[PDB]
Amino acid sequence: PGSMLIFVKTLTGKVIHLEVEPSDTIENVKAKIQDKEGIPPDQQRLAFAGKSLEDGRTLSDYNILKDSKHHPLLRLR
Amino acid sequence: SFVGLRVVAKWSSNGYFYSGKITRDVGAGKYKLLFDDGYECDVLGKDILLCDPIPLDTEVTALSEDEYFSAGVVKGHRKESGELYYSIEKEGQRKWYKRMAVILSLEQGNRLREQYGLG
Numbered sequence: 001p002g003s004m005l006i007f008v009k010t011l012t013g014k015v016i017h018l019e020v021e022p023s024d025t026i027e028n029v030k031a032k033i034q035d036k037e038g039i040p041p042d043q044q045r046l047a048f049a050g051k052s053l054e055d056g057r058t059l060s061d062y063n064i065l066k067d068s069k070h071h072p073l074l075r076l077r
Numbered sequence: 078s079f080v081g082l083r084v085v086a087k088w089s090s091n092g093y094f095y096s097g098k099i100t101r102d103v104g105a106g107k108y109k110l111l112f113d114d115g116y117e118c119d120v121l122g123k124d125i126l127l128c129d130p131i132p133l134d135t136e137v138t139a140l141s142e143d144e145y146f147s148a149g150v151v152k153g154h155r156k157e158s159g160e161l162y163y164s165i166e167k168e169g170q171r172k173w174y175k176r177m178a179v180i181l182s183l184e185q186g187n188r189l190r191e192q193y194g195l196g
Contacts, residue, residue: 049144069147072144073145
């Protein structure tokens with residue numbers, strides 16, 4: 001696949017990394033955060049560079065993913 | 078004698094290395110680490126690099142203002158009343174990054190293990 005590396009900063013400050021595809025939905029990303037960090041999706045509000053990422057869009061919908069050399073840091077809030 | 082030392086360490090087998098401090102030798106080959114990001118956990122000593130600061134010309138991964146991590150090279154450091162900043166060059170351009178904005182990929186950290194690995 002064409003998977004890509006992103007980072008996520010939790011509320012505690014802990015940074016994790018995930019492999020995602022440009023076609024993953026925000027809900028799918030929250031499900032991956034859940035799988036890795038146990039944070040229920042009902043607790044999870046994601047943003048990139050201060051813009052809310054909403055359920056039912058993909059990462060590509062937000063123009064977040066670039067090339068494989070630049071890894072966006074999402075933040076939970 | 079490793080307790081209180083600044084390190085860069087990873088907490089998963091394929092993960093990145095993050096800055097932190099050793100707070101205790103806990104045995105079973107592990108050390109309790111308080112990461113600058115706040116996470117604390119017991120990490121394997123093999124996954125700890127005893128280098129502080131990260132040396133000149135090290136290839137690192139740094140968080141730019143645009144909220145993307147990408148590779149760069151350390152070109153200098155400044156300690157401004159407690160805080161360490163790194164000067165990191167990317168495609169010819171130098172910017173200053175806080176210590177906690179500078180991390181190492183698996184390969185980048187692996188490059189430093191023979192010189193700075195704990196053990």
